[PDB]
Coordinates of C-alpha atoms in Angstrom, one line a residue:
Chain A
X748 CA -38.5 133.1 23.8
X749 CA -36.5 131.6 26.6
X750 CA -33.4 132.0 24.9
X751 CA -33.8 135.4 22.7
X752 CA -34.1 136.8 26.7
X753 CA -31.2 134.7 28.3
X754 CA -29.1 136.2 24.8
X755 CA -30.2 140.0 25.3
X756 CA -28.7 139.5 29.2
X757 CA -25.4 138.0 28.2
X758 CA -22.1 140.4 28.4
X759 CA -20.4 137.1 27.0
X760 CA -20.2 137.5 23.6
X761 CA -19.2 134.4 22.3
X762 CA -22.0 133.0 24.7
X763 CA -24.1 135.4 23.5
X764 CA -23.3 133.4 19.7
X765 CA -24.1 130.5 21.4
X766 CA -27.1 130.5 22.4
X767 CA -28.7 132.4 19.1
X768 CA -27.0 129.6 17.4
X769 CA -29.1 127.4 19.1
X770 CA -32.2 129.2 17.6
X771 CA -31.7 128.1 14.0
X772 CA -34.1 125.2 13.0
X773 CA -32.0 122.9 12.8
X774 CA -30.0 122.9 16.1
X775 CA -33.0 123.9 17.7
X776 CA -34.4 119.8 16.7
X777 CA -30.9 118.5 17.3
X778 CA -29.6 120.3 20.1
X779 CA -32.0 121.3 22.1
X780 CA -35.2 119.2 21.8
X781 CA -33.7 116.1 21.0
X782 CA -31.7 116.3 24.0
X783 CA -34.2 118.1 26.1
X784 CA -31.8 120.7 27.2
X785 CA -33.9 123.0 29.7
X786 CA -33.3 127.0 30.6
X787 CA -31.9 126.1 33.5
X788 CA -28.9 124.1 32.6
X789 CA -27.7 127.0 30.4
X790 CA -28.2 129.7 32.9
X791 CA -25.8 126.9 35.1
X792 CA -23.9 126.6 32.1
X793 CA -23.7 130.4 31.4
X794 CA -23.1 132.3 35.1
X795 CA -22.4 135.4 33.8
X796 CA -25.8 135.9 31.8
X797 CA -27.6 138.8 34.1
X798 CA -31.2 137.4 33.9
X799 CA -32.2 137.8 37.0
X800 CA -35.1 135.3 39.2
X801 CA -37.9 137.4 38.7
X802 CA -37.9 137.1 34.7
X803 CA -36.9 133.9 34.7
X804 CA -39.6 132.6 37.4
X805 CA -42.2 134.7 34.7
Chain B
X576 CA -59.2 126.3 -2.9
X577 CA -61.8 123.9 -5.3
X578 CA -64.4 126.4 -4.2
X579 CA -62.2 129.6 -5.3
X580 CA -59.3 130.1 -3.5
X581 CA -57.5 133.3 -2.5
X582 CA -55.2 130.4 -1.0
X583 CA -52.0 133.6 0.4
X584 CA -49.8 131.3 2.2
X585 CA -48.8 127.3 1.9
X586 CA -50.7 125.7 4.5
X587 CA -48.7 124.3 8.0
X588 CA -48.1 121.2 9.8
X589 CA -47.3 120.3 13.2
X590 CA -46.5 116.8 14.4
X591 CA -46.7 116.3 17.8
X592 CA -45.0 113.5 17.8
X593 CA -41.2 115.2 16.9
X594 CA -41.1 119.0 16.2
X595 CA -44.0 120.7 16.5
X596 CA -42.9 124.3 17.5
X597 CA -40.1 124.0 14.5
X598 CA -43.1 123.7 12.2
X599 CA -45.2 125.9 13.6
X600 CA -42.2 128.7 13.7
X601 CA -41.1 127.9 10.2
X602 CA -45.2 128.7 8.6
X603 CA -45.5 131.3 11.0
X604 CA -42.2 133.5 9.3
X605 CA -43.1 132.3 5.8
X606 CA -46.9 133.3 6.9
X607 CA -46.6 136.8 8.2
X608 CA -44.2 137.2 5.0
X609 CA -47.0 135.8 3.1
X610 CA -49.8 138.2 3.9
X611 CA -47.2 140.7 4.0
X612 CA -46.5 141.3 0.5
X613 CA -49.4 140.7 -0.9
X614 CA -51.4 143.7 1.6
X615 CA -49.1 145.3 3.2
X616 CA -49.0 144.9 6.8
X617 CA -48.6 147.0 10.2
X618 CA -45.3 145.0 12.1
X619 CA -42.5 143.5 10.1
X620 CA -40.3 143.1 10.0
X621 CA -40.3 145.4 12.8
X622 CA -41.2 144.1 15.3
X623 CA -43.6 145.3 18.0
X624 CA -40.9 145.0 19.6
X625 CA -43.1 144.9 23.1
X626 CA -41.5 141.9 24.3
X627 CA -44.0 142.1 27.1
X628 CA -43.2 142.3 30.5
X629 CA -43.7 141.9 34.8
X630 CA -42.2 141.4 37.7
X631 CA -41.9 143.2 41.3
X632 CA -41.7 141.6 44.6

């Protein structure tokens, strides 16, 4: 969920790749739970995704 | 299903040990799917697409 809404607010297109990448089963496992890689590390990682506090607070 | 089963979709498992939300997402799809076909349905797949929402301070 976290990352279908970070995707919908990135103007980066390959970003925007990126992260729906990361919503296949498989790098979902590998990538992000075997690594524990949190919301908040991509929204460092990706500045120019518009989410904005009050939907990511929510 | 030794009782007479109308047995739609494969059951699911999750293991909480490793990848339980994997799981859980990959019977969920096949599920909907499932049930789909064999009724019909009312949001495929569509969507519902109310990805809910709130926030205002």
């Amino acid at each position: 969920t976290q990352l279908r809404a970070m995707a919908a607010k990135t103007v980066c297109p390959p970003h925007k790749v990126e992260l729906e990448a990361l919503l296949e089963k498989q790098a979902y496992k590998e990538q992000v739970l075997a690594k524990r890689l949190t919301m908040l590390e991509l929204l460092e990682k990706y500045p120019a995704c518009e989410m904005k506090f009050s939907e990511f607070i929510a | 299903a030794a009782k007479g089963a109308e047995n739609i979709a494969d059951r699911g498992e999750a293991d909480a040990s490793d990848d339980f939300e994997g799981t859980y997402e990959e019977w969920r799809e096949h599920m909907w799917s499932d049930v789909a076909a064999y009724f019909n349905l009312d949001i495929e797949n569509s969507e519902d697409n109310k990805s809910t929402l709130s926030l205002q301070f």
